[PDB]
Amino acid sequence: GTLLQPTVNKFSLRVFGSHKAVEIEQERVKSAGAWIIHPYSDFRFYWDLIMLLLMVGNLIVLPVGITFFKEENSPPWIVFNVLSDTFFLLDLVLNFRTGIVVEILLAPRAIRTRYLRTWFLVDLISSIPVDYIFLVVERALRIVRFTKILSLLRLLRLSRLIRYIHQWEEIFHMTYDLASAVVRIFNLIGMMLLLCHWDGCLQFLVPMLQDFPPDCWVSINHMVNHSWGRQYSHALFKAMSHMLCIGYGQQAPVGMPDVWLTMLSMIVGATCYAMFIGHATALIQSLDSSRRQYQEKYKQVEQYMSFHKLPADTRQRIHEYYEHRYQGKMFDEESILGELSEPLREEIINFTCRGLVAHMPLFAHADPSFVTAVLTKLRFEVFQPGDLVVREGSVGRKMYFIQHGLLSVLTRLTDGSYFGEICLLTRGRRTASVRADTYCRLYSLSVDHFNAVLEEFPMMRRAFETVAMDRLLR
Template identity: 85%
Template sequence: RFYWDLIMLLLMVGNLIILPVGITFFKDENTPPWIVFNVLSDTFFLADLVLNFRTGIVVEDNTEIILDPHTIKMKYLKTWFLVDFISSIPVDYIFLIVDLETQVDSDVYKTARALRIVRFTKILSLLRLLRLSRLIRYIHQWEEIFHMTYDLASAVVRIFNLIGMMLLLCHWDGCLQFLVPMLQDFPRDSWVSRSHMVNDSWGKQYSHALFKAMSHMLCIGYGQQTPQGMTDVWLTMLSMIVGATCYAMFIGHATALIQSLDSSRRQYQEKYKQVEQYMSFHKLPGDTRQRIHEYYEHRYQGKMFDEENILGELSEPLKEEIINFNCRSLVANMPLFANADPNFVTAMLTKLRFEVFQPGDFIIREGTVGKKMYFIQHGVVSILTKGNKETKLSDGSYFGEICLLTRGRRTASVRADTYCRLYSL
């Protein structure tokens, strides 16, 4: 089903691009390439119409897939079947058979051209939109294989969707700019007649029509000539309205996308602005401000999460799994945890609190009541006792456990020699 959906997606894009061009710029649609393309398209769309009656339906909360044939059939008949059926009628089969039997005048082919526009209702099909969402999920899985984050993959897909939709609307509008004068047999006041392009090649006609449409939609002018005929005036106004609306939507979506792309970094920046205002308001000295800045840099590393709230919303098994993963380096480097019972390790890790200390900070002072013990994830500390030589502790070590158990006073001071990332219990 994945490969079929991918084929239908590519075929859909091809139809949305090629059909307007064929309808607008090619008078003779009875050429072999055009017939082959439309016959193949009709065949695939009719086959897809039949497959839709055999495709499961995902419930809105994504907890269940309905596979009952009768339910699927009734659901499809009540939703997009009519639109899909009308847009999948094999017009080319019908007119090809009629043409083989009798000679059909050009008016009939104009009617076929008009009917072909119905194919554009495919874009409204919810099933097609679901296929686009499936493609995004597939791309997300591929991005995970290459160790890319979800935010980056999602952002790339959304950006390409916005740009693609803008280009597609410009393409449609360009075809419309030429189609309307063509249906009126190119009046003298139309832009095509005034530009003397009635008999030019379709490439030149399309290029000028697309330039005219993009000038309207981007609100940068009228193109090469100002509209004179009533039809051109209304087409210009329509293009401007659609273009201005799409441009506003594009800016809004792009702004929201940029803001949500790295919300944790934005949250950190907003928090640090408050800290800067606090330091300025209290007129803190420069060296203190520098230490505060360095503390935030090492503590949050440019990103800020409400970890307590995030973990509090999860189930206990999932919360324990995340904590074990986040503390895996601590467990691996600490002999106390390496050979301990896994349930004991998990219970200990859930009680730990992450802390950061700067060089020169006294983590423990001699003579104070011991209420915590510390595990060193990264960094070097010095044990300072009166009359004894300094003792160094580094990654995987722990200290302060005796006073935690006895509730006695500290017998030594502990000073951070480097930036230390500790867990306290």
């Protein structure tokens, strides 16, 4: 009895919010009882999965059954039509109690007026069997052709199929992350295949109603008395060749109703192929945008290089810097770390600098709170070999830690080491000079952040003082 209520699911959590909002929605459904179908409930799922398959089966089978078969009084055809009319009438009956997303669950007022204003007439016309009525109520050939065109009123179920497919596609952008362009283009492919299947049946249907004049292509190809499969094959070939703008026959089409159907199918095919090109272009432009932005940024850089007329060796030095800095990846490290929360930043920086945790003895013994408080305030820097990181007699600004590479002070030291220590404490000038031997990834620490961390932790101040005196002894 709870199947009319929306259950607790991932889409339910992402739409309603917490479990309490889901319970509020369930109580709003339970305001009335067995009169309201919530539009996110599993009953609408369990119904629409049936109705989509039935609608696809009818929209494929029904024109082939109308146009190509001669004796329309076969029993399983009548059984199939009766079943289709039954389910598509029960669908409207269940629609009457259903909810409407704009979620207006007011049953006696909003539902009835929203149907009678928007989408009751089309579903009502497509639901009921019109041809059986005129058969019961009622020059026989005009009557039979009239009943055939009336039986073509079943084709308005397409408008309901489109509505349910768009409701599904609005649902499954949220339970699964899907590229939008893929959904759009497979929707368009289904529409195009369906339209070509219509035009085949139509271009056989029109010479049927005129009792095959000698001007029509069926009489010219002498294929009146073949089986329905081969006639369907030739008609579909003709329709697809008009639709993809080919050029079908030897002669121009002579009969006047052939000309206008031809022109109609040509226009429809040209517009559908144009929209298909558009969707394919929009899909292709969204494949390697991360690599494309890197390309645009380097175009911008060499534009700036050209503006100041820089030398060639400097230009390739810049190029090597970008190749060993970004590695073809155009990411904004500031905004991504800004969009996150604090524990995510802590976990990321721990995973990136557990090597610096492991090699350094000062981080081996201290509290991990202190370790994270240091690590959250570093900055990643990359140097090229031959460069002097710190020159002697500087102002003194920053400390450095060593991720990779080895560095030479004119006394060499490899990765896992550190320098820039004592000049922050003594506040003096730079004692020795540090060179870059290779590409060396470094993390840097600002002095204001350093004093803030020392204000947060007094014992590591004495630890740095002891290791600075040891460094002075070295």
